[PDB]
């Protein structure tokens, strides 16, 4: 069971060894398209690449490469696209992928600048009157509205295929107070944020897969998807005990490398799922307690 395992591993201070065992058993698949010379400048970190079998292909005949992986969770019935923070030259690719994949939401888990370094291009417009046009992919992006809370921001964007003039509303969910180092002490603000994304319909199956990223798209993005899928699985059977987090994480790692970057993120994932279980279980009032403790 999950809380029993958590305490056992905690009282024993073996989180590093648990996490390292996951590192060792994790799938290894080729990344040959990612490594081709013509794609060097499409990759933010040379040590973070999409496997060839799960990579998102741009619908273009020149170069279909973007550093993005489709994580398809069969049992949980939820799909996610995990990607790096766009580079100055891949912002058009990024929105092209969002369009072609029919995604409704983008989850951003980083700030544009962290630890005094640029982690991510400014890939969405900050002012309604200053829309962005990506000439390569022929897409137009307009800030429609913005809802700033204390630790996250929700933006409504309109994405227009400048070729076909059809338009889509994209929801941008921007979690802004992940700490520069370490993980959050309590998972309540994290869970309140995940449920905000869930309530927007961005995760539901009539839309394309949600796009999730931080700078590399494996650590914080890994934590987000793992907690969501774990909670989803406990829901479908209401069997808290039947969900094995580590086996869910290893299943996810079949689709993109490196998901969950530190042992403390693994531990936090446990925290989030355990606490999130209090909602799944029938205690609907626990969601509003997280909204209080989060200070949104």
Swiss-Prot record:
In-chain residues carrying the UniProt-annotated modification Cysteine sulfinic acid (-SO2H): 214
Entry keyword set: Acetylation, Endoplasmic reticulum, Hydrolase, Membrane, Oxidation, Phosphoprotein, Protein phosphatase, S-nitrosylation
Transmembrane helix as UniProt keyword = no
Q: In which tissues is it expressed?
A: Expressed in keratinocytes (at protein level).
Predominant location: endoplasmic reticulum
Q: Name one GO cellular component term.
A: cytoplasmic side of endoplasmic reticulum membrane
Q: Which residues carry this modification: Phosphoserine?
A: 49, 241-242
List residues of cross-link (N,N-(cysteine-1,S-diyl)serine (Cys-Ser)). Answer: 214-215
Sites where the protein binds substrate: 180, 214-220, 261
Record's comment on post-translational modification: Oxidized on Cys-214; the Cys-SOH formed in response to redox signaling reacts with the alpha-amido of the following residue to form a sulfenamide cross-link, triggering a conformational change that inhibits substrate binding and activity. The active site can be restored by reduction. Ser-49 is the major site of phosphorylation as compared to Ser-241 and Ser-242. Activated by phosphorylation at Ser-49.
Entry-annotated residues carrying Cysteine sulfenic acid (-SOH): 214
Superkingdom is Eukaryota
Q: Which residues carry this modification: Cysteine persulfide?
A: 214
Q: What is its EC number?
A: 3.1.3.48
Residue numbers carrying Phosphotyrosine: 19, 65
EC class, as a word, reads: hydrolase
Membrane protein topology class: Peripheral membrane protein
Q: S-nitrosocysteine occurs at which residues?
A: 214
Q: Which GO terms describe its molecular function?
A: cadherin binding; enzyme binding; ephrin receptor binding; insulin receptor binding; non-membrane spanning protein tyrosine phosphatase activity; protein kinase binding; protein phosphatase 2A binding; protein tyrosine phosphatase activity
Indicate the segments forming the Tyrosine-protein phosphatase domain, all copies.
Answer: 2-276
The family classification in the record reads:
Belongs to the protein-tyrosine phosphatase family. Non-receptor class 1 subfamily.
Q: What does this protein do?
A: Tyrosine-protein phosphatase which acts as a regulator of endoplasmic reticulum unfolded protein response. Mediates dephosphorylation of EIF2AK3/PERK; inactivating the protein kinase activity of EIF2AK3/PERK. May play an important role in CKII- and p60c-src-induced signal transduction cascades. May regulate the EFNA5-EPHA3 signaling pathway which modulates cell reorganization and cell-cell repulsion. May also regulate the hepatocyte growth factor receptor signaling pathway through dephosphorylation of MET.
**What name appears for this protein in its UniProt entry?**
Tyrosine-protein phosphatase non-receptor type 1
């Amino acid at each position: 069971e999950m809380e029993k395992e958590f305490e056992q591993i905690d009282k024993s201070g073996s989180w590093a060894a648990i996490y390292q065992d996951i590192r060792h058993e994790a799938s290894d698949f080729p990344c040959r398209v990612a490594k081709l010379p013509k794609n060097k400048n499409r990759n933010r970190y040379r040590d973070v690449s999409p496997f060839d079998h799960s990579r998102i292909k741009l619908h273009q005949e020149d170069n279909d490469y973007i550093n993005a992986s489709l994580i398809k969770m069969e049992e949980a019935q939820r799909s996610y696209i995990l990607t790096q923070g766009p580079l100055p030259n891949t912002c058009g690719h990024f929105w092209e992928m969002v369009w072609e994949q029919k995604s409704r939401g983008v989850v951003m888990l980083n700030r544009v600048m962290e630890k005094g370094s640029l982690k991510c291009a400014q890939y969405w417009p900050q002012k309604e009157e200053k829309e962005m046009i990506f000439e390569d992919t022929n897409l137009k992006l307009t800030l429609i509205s913005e809802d700033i809370k204390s630790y996250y921001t929700v933006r409504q964007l309109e994405l227009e295929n400048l070729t076909t003039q059809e338009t889509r509303e994209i929801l941008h969910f921007h979690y802004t107070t992940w700490p520069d180092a370490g993980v959050p002490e309590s998972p309540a603000s994290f869970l309140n944020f995940l449920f905000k994304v869930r309530e927007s319909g961005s995760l539901s199956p009539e839309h394309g897969p949600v796009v999730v990223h931080c700078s590399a798209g494996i650590g914080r993005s890994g934590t987000f998807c793992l907690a969501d899928t774990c909670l989803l699985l406990m829901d479908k059977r209401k069997d808290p005990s039947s969900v094995d987090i580590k086996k869910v994480l290893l299943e996810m790692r079949k689709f993109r490398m490196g998901l969950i970057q530190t042992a403390d993120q693994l531990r936090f994932s446990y925290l989030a799922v355990i606490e999130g279980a209090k909602f799944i279980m029938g205690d609907s009032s626990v969601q509003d307690q997280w909204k209080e403790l989060s200070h949104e």
